[PDB]
XYZ file of C-alpha atoms in Angstrom:
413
model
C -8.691 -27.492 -2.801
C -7.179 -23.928 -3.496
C -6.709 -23.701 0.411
C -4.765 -27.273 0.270
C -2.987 -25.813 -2.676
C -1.815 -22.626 -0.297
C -0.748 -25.267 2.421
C 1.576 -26.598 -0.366
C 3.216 -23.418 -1.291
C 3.595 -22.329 2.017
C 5.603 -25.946 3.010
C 7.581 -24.471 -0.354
C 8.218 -20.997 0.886
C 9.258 -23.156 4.470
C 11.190 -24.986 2.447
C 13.251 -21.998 0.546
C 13.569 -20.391 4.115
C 15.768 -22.944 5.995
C 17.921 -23.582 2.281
C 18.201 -19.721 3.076
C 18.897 -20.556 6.246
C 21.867 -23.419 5.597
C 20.970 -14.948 8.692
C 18.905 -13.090 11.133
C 16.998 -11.600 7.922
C 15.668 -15.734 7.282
C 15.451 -16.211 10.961
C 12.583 -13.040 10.888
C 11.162 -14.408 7.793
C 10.916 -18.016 9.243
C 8.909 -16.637 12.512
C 6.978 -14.435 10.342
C 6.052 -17.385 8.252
C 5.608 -19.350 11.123
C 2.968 -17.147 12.501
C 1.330 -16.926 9.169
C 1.144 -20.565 9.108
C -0.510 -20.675 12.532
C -3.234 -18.616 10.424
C -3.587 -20.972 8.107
C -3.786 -23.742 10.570
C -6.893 -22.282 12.488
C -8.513 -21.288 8.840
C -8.566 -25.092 8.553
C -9.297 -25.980 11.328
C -12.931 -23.774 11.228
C -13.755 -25.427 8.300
C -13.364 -28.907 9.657
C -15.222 -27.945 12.135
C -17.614 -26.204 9.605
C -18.491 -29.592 7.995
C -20.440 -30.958 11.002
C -22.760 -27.665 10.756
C -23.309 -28.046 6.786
C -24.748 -31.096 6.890
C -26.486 -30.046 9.749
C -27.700 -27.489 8.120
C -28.413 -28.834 4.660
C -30.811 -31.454 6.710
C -32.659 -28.886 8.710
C -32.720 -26.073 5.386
C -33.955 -29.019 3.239
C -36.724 -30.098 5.795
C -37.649 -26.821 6.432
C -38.204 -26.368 2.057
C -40.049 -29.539 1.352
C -42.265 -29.861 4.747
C -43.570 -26.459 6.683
C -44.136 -24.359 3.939
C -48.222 -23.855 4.321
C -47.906 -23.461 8.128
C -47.980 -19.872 10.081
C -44.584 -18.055 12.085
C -45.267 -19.995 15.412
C -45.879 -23.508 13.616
C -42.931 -22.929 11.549
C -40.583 -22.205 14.806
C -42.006 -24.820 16.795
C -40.866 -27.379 13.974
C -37.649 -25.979 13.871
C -36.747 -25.961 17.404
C -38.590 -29.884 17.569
C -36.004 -30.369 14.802
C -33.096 -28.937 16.455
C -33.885 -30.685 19.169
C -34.200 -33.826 18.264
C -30.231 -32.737 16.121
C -28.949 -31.974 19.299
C -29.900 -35.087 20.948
C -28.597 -37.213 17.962
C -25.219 -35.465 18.157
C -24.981 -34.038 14.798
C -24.025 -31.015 14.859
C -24.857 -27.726 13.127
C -24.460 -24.070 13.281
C -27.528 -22.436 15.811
C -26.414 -18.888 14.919
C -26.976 -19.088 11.371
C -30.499 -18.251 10.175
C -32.458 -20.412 7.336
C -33.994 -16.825 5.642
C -29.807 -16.662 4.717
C -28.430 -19.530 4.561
C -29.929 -19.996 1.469
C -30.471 -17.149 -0.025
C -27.580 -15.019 -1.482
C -26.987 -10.935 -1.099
C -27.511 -10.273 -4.896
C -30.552 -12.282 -4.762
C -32.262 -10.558 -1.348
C -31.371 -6.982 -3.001
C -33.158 -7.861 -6.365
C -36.315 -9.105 -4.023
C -36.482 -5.834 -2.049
C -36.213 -4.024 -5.574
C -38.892 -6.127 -6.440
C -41.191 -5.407 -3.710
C -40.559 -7.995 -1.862
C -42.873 -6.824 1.588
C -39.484 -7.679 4.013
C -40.525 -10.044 6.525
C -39.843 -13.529 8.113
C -43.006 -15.096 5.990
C -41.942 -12.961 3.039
C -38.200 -14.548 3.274
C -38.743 -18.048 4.009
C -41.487 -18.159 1.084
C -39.100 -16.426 -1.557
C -36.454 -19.042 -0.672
C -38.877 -21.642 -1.081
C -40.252 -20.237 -4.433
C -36.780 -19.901 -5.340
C -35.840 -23.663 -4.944
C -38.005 -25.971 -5.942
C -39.045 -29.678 -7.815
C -42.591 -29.491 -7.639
C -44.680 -26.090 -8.800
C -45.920 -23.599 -5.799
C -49.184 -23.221 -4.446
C -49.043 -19.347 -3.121
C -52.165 -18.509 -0.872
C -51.985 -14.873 -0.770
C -54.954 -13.046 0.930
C -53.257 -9.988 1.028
C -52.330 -10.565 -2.360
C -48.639 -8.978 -1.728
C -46.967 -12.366 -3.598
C -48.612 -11.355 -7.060
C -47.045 -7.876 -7.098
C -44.039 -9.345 -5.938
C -44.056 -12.612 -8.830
C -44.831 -9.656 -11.311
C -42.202 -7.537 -10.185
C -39.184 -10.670 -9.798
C -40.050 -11.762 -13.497
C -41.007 -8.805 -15.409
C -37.361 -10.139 -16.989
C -38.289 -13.066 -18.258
C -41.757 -11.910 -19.102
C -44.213 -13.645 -16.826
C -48.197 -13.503 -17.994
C -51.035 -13.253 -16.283
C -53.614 -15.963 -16.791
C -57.099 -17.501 -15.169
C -58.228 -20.896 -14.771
C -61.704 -19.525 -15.688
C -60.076 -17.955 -18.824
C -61.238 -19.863 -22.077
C -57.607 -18.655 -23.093
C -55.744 -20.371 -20.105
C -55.374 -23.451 -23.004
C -53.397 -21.156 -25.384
C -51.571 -19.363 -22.616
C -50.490 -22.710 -20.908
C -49.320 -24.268 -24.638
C -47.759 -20.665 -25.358
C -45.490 -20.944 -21.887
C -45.008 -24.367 -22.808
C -43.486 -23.368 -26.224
C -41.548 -20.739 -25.566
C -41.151 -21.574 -22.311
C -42.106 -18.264 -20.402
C -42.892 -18.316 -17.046
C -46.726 -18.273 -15.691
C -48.893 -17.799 -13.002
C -52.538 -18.818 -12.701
C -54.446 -16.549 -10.230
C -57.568 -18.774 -9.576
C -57.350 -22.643 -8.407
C -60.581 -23.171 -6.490
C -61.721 -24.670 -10.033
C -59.210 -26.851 -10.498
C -58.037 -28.030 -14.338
C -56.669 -31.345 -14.289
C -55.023 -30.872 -17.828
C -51.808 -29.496 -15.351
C -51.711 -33.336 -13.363
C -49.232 -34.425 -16.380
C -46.993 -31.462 -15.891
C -47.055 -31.108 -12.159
C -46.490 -34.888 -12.247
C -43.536 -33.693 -14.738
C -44.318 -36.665 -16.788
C -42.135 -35.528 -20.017
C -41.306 -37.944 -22.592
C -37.746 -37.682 -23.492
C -37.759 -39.082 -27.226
C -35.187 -38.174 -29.833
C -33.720 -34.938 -29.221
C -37.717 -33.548 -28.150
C -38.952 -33.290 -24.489
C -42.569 -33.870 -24.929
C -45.518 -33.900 -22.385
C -49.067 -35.036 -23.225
C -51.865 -32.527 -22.925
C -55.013 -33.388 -23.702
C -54.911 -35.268 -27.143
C -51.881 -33.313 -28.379
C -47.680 -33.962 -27.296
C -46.687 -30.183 -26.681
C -42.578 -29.951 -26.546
C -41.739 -28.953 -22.951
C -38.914 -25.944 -22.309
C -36.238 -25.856 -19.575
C -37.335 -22.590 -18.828
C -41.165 -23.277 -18.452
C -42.265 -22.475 -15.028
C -46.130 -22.275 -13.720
C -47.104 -20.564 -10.716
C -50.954 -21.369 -9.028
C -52.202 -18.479 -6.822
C -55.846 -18.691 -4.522
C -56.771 -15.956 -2.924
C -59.568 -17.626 -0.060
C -57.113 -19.189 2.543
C -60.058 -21.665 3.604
C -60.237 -22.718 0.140
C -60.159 -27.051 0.247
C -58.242 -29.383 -2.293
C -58.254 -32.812 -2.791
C -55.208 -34.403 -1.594
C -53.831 -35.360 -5.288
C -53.501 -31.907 -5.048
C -52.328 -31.347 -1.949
C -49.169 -34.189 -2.854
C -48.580 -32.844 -6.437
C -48.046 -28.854 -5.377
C -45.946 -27.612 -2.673
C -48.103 -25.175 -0.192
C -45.666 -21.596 0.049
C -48.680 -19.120 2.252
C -48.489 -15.602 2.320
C -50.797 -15.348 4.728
C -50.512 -12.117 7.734
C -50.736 -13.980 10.988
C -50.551 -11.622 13.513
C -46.576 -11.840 14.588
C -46.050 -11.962 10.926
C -47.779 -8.626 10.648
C -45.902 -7.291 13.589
C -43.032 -8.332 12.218
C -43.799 -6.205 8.802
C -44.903 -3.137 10.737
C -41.627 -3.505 12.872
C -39.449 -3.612 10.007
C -41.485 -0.858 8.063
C -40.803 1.611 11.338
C -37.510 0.598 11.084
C -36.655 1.405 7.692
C -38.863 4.823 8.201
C -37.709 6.051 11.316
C -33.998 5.874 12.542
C -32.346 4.918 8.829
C -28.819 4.179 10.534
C -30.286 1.008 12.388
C -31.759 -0.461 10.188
C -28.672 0.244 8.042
C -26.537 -1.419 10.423
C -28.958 -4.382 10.421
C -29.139 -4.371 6.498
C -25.202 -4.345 6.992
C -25.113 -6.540 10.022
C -24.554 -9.760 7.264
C -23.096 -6.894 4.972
C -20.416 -6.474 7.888
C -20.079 -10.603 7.466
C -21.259 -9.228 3.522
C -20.066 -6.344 2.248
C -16.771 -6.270 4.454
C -16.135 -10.056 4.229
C -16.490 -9.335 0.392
C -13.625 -7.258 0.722
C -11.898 -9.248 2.826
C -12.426 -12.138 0.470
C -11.300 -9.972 -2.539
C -8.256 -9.133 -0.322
C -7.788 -12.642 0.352
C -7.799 -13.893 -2.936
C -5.584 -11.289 -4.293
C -3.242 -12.380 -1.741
C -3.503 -15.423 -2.952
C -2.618 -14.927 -6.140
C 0.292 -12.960 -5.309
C 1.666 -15.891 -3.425
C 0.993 -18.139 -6.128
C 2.364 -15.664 -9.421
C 5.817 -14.833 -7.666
C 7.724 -16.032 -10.484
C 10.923 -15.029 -8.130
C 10.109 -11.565 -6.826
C 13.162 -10.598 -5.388
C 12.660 -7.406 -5.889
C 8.948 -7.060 -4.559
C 8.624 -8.578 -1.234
C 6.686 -6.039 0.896
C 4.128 -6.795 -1.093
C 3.312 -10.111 0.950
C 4.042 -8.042 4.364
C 1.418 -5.435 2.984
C -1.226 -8.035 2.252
C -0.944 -9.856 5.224
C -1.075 -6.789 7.045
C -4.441 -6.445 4.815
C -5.972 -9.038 6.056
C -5.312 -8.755 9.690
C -7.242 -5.372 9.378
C -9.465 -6.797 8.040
C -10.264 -9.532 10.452
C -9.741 -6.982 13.189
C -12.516 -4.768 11.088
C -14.861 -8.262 11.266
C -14.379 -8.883 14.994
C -15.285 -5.079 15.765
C -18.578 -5.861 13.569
C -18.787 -8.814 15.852
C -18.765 -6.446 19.113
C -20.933 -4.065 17.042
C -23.319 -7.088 16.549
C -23.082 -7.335 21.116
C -23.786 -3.695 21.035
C -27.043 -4.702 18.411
C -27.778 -7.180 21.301
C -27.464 -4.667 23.968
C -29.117 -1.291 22.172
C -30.330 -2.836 18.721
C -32.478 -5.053 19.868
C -33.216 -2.282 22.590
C -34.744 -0.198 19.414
C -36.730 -3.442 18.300
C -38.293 -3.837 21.417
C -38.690 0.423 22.206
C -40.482 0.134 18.712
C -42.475 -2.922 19.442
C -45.472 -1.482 21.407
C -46.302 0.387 18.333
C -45.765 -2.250 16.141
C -48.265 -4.733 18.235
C -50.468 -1.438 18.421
C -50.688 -1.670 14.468
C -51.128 -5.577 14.135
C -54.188 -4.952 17.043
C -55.343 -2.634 14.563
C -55.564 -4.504 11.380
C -56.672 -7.474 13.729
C -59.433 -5.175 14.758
C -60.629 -4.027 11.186
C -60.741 -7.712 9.521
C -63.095 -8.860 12.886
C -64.587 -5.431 12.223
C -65.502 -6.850 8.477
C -68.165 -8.904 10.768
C -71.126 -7.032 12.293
C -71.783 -5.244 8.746
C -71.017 -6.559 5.332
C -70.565 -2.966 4.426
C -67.079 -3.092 6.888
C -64.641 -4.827 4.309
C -60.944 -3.613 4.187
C -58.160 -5.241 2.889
C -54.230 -4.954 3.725
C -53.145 -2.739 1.005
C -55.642 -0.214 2.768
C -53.908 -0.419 6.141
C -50.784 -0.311 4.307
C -51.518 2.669 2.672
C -52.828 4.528 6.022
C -49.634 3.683 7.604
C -47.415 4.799 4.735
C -49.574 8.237 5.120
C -49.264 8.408 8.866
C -45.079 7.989 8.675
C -44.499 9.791 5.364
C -46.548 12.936 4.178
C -47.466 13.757 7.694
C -47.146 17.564 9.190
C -46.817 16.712 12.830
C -43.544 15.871 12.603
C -42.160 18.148 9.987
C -40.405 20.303 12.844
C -39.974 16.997 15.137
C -36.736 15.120 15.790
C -36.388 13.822 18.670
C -36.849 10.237 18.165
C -38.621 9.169 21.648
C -41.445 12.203 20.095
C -41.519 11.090 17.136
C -42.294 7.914 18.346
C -45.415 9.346 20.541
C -46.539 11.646 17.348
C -46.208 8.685 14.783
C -48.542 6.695 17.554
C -51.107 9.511 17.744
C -51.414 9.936 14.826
């Protein structure tokens, strides 16, 4: 609407130009506002050629939230691509490029996750979108455990309590986070409590100005703001399929490309800062840059619709314009920085991938190694904490910086 509202003013300022015309100074204006109109043309033209790809890619987001969120990376892509497929051959269109771990997510939002230890990874994304959004209450599997630091961490703000199902106080704690509404999280499921099938069936009773939902013999008033997380740790844990239909499934368990994925990232981020800076600020460059370019855009905009009659301020339009053509140039660099990420970029993913699969063999090799003694039990958070050790704190590299070394070192050691 605000871009149909530009179109408007600019048939105005066309307009005002040939009554200025009825006079080379008009005729540059006209051409100049001819071009700029040509802009605006094309800027409409993307985005009616943009609404194809959003409902494409509401329908394949949305099936990707509801369905697929228990299954591994592989099962997840495989349903994706069946889905695309299947798109493709229907003729509805929708943007490939695009990635679901952004499209519904937001900057702000992926920032406050990796300040709340959010362990950056394909798995880790998808399942913090889904836990996000939602209209029935998650089911996180955690083995690793990782999604209970990070739940603590993302709502230490609105105060989020720990509480068991084999707690004798889970009763209070529940009718507590019903009445004021906090947030909660129950670690332990295996031994199910039924007293949570009227709430996860969200059977509230809206009468009078009271939101009510039965539990037990007592009505309890529900709050907007109540939310109730269920956590189990065993990932061959059963449940019965009430269950399994009232509570969406969101895993956090480390299949092996997911842990390859993690170590790849964590190298990343160690070793080489300015890629994975670039990556960080490869959406920042459609981020960061586009902000300002949208800031730009809109300030432009409200010049153009504020002039009141500025006569005597008119570069100011030639300046913006200007503005925004650098920064659209700035974007379509970014865009042949993003070939060069394709050409060298993805070069250092794959350079860095041997070690990565070296360190997913690893783990893979401990948790079988849990099997010919009892005494042989290690968990993630150890590996984790050897490979923080062997990239930071570490002397054989304190002198080192050739990256292609410190590569071999980092693997050594």
């Amino acid at each position: 609407m605000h871009l149909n509202v530009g179109l408007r003013k600019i048939k105005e300022t066309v307009d005002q130009v040939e009554e200025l015309r009825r006079v080379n100074r008009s005729t540059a204006l006209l051409k100049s506002l001819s071009a700029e109109r040509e802009r605006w043309e094309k800027t409409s033209e993307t985005f009616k050629n943009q609404m194809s790809t959003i409902a494409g890619d509401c329908l394949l987001s949305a099936a990707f939230i509801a369905y697929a969120g228990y299954f591994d990376q592989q099962m997840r892509q495989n349903l994706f691509t069946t889905w695309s497929h299947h798109l493709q051959q229907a003729n509805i269109q929708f943007r490939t490029d695009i990635a679901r771990t952004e499209y519904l997510s937001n900057a702000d939002e992926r920032l406050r996750w990796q300040a709340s230890s959010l362990p950056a990874d394909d798995l880790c994304t998808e399942n913090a979108i889904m836990l996000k959004r939602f209209n029935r209450y998650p089911l996180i599997i955690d083995p690793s455990g990782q999604a209970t630091e990070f739940i603590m961490n993302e709502y230490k703000d609105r105060k989020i309590t720990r509480t068991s199902f084999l707690d004798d106080a889970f009763r209070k704690n529940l009718e507590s986070a019903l009445r004021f509404g906090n947030p909660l999280l129950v670690q332990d499921v295996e031994s199910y409590d039924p007293v949570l099938n009227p709430v996860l069936n969200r059977e509230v009773r809206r009468t009078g100005g009271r939101v009510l939902i039965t539990l037990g013999d007592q009505d309890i008033d529900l709050s907007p703001s109540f939310v109730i997380f269920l956590s189990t740790r065993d990932p061959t844990v059963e449940f019965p399929p009430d269950l399994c239909s009232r509570v969406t499934f969101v895993n956090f368990t480390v299949t092996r490309s997911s842990l390859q994925s993690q170590c790849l990232n964590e190298v990343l981020k160690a070793e080489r800062p300015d890629v994975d800076e670039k990556r960080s600020d490869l959406l920042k460059l459609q981020g960061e840059f586009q902000l300002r370019l949208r800031q730009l855009e809109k300030s432009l905009l409200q010049a153009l619709n504020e002039v009141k009659g500025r006569i005597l301020d008119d570069d100011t339009i030639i300046t913006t314009l200007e503005n925004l053509k650098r920064e659209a140039a700035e974007v379509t660099r970014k865009v042949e920085e993003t070939d060069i990420v394709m050409q060298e970029v993805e070069t250092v993913s794959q350079q860095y991938l041997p070690l990565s699969t070296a360190c997913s063999s690893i783990y893979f090799t401990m948790e079988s190694l849990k099997q010919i003694h009892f005494l042989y039990q290690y968990s993630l958070q150890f590996f984790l904490d050897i490979y923080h050790n062997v990239l930071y704190e570490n002397p054989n590299l304190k002198g080192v910086t050739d990256h292609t070394q410190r590569l071999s070192i980092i693997t050594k050691d």
